[PDB]
Enzyme design. Sequence first.
Site, PDB file in Angstrom:
ATOM      1  N   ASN A  30       0.684  -0.963  -0.053  1.00 19.32           N
ATOM      2  CA  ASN A  30       0.018   0.222   0.076  1.00 19.32           C
ATOM      3  C   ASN A  30       0.858   1.391   0.250  1.00 19.32           C
ATOM      4  O   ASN A  30       2.206   0.674   0.070  1.00 19.32           O
ATOM      5  CB  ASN A  30      -1.383   0.197   1.142  1.00 19.32           C
ATOM      6  CG  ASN A  30      -0.617   0.143   2.115  1.00 19.32           C
ATOM      7  OD1 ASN A  30       1.111  -0.656   2.856  1.00 19.32           O
ATOM      8  ND2 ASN A  30      -0.933   1.011   3.068  1.00 19.32           N
ATOM      9  N   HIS A  41       5.617   6.048  -6.626  1.00 23.53           N
ATOM     10  CA  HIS A  41       6.305   4.437  -6.637  1.00 23.53           C
ATOM     11  C   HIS A  41       7.485   4.743  -5.981  1.00 23.53           C
ATOM     12  O   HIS A  41       8.231   5.317  -6.196  1.00 23.53           O
ATOM     13  CB  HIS A  41       5.545   3.392  -7.415  1.00 23.53           C
ATOM     14  CG  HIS A  41       4.613   3.352  -7.612  1.00 23.53           C
ATOM     15  ND1 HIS A  41       3.567   2.646  -7.378  1.00 23.53           N
ATOM     16  CD2 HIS A  41       4.003   4.747  -8.794  1.00 23.53           C
ATOM     17  CE1 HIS A  41       2.236   2.494  -7.311  1.00 23.53           C
ATOM     18  NE2 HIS A  41       2.215   4.012  -8.616  1.00 23.53           N
TER      19      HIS A  41
END
EC number: 3.2.2.29
Length: 196
Positions: A30, A41
């Site tokens: 998550n 990311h």
Amino acid sequence: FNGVSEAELLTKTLPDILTFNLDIVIIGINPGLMAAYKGHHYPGPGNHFWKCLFMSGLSEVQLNHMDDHTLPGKYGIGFTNMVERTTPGSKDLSSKEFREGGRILVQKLQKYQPRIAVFNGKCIYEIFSKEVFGVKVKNLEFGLQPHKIPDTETLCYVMPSSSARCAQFPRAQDKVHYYIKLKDLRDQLKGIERNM
DNA sequence: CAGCTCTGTACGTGAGCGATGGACAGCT
DNA sequence: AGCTGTCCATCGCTCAGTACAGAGCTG
């Protein structure tokens, strides 16, 4: 985080970077606080992902979180997470969140069909296998898994989480082996495709 | 008993925080 | 020389899943 409260970050989500014909989809747990903050990311100092990607040769140069949208077209790599909700750590998520996530994830993998679904963390593959394959081990290992995503040719490959939270792989160097073996698996799959 | 599931405990690096104080230069 | 403030080197410190033992459960 530059005057942005934790409360504000907990409402944020991280968009998927998914396309068809990918070699690899990196599946995280998550978003952590820095990922929620940046909208990219694996940013920041508590994560080994970008350093391992370069050290293994999966990228020929050192890249960072800002390069993540270029990874499908340039490197054949995409991104998603098992659970959407941002938390400081993975132990703040419920079992129902994980299983909802697992269901959503298998649909995404059945749509995009990458050559390899990479579970960036053993804990999420433990949940995924139990939910999708109805298999619980006793004793789960890293690397290539013996089941394909249902109704696809997509393989499952597991690595220790790129988070620097785990003490068993204390440095980016301790995880590079798994990224090199992921690269070898991709090259083997491309090699087979050429030979039909 | 023997396999299980579930739960709580213990564990290494290194990047980068705020805090501290040394080096140093401007000024008198 | 005496004083001062800034810069920045350096400090101590925190912290971004995994493995496993043992209790509880069930066949």
